[PDB]
Amino acid sequence: MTVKFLGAGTAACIADLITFPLDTAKVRLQIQGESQGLVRTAASAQYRGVLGTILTMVRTEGPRSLYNGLVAGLQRQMSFASVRIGLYDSVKQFYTKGSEHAGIGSRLLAGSTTGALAVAVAQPTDVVKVRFQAQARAGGGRRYQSTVEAYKTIAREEGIRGLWKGTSPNVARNAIVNCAELVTYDLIKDTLLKANLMTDDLPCHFTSAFGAGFCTTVIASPVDVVKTRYMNSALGQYHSAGHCALTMLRKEGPRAFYKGFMPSFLRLGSWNVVMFVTYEQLKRALMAAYQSREAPF
Hints:
Structural class: mainly alpha
Radius of gyration: 23 Å
Site (Important for inhibition by GDP): 129, 173
Distance between the termini: 16 Å
Membrane topology: Multi-pass membrane protein
Helix content: 55-70%
Order of helices and strands: HHHHHHHHHHHHHHH
Main location: mitochondrion
Number of helices: 15
CATH topology: Mitochondrial carrier fold
Largest sheet: none
CATH superfamily: Mitochondrial carrier domain
Solcar repeats: 2-94, 102-191, 200-285
CATH architecture: Alpha/alpha barrel
Protein name: Dicarboxylate carrier UCP2
């Protein structure tokens, strides 16, 4: 029997499949900071052709190479649903709690405090997975490396700071969305939430949302746009976020933002599909009252 957990359960499975091949395209689409000098002797060896690159990976190691690690990708997906067994109900009940006739500020403080606290317990899996994909050229040294082995060796040469590279901005990312969320969230409550679902015309409310849906996405786009600009560089003399603001005003007019934005746009098409799958469940749900009735009683 299906349910909300399993509906979500079906959700996590489809989204990463059509999205995993996406990462390989972004990195190739780079001037190749490798500059190993290999590029100048041969400035090609990999056309934009996305069909081309995916073909290249299997013949690189072998067919067993695509099915090797396959068990590791799922476990990625395995933990997301498991944590939502507690961190979902927990931050969620922390922000929508009845209350009395206010507490919007309280919710910011509860949400800001709890979320920051939550990253505290879980985080190492998220940092390693991006870094893990980056560790390239298969892997030699008789015994094949692993997650436990992978974390420690780069840490010896690179240190803690190497590791925090993503950790610090990730926390910042959480704050802005929530910050963005409270301003945004107010708007959803006003429509169709004046007294929570109080109409038999279910199809009517949905159509209102879609038209509404396109308008919200434009609001959604800005967090995505700023991220791509970064690509302009990597590593240097950037102490914290604030150094960018002083630097940006002095050099590189605000026009630089308008230019360079092809990756995010590409992200937007793929990113758009993931929201759609949740909508699909809403479109097609369970269908048996007696079955649903028996579970809660």
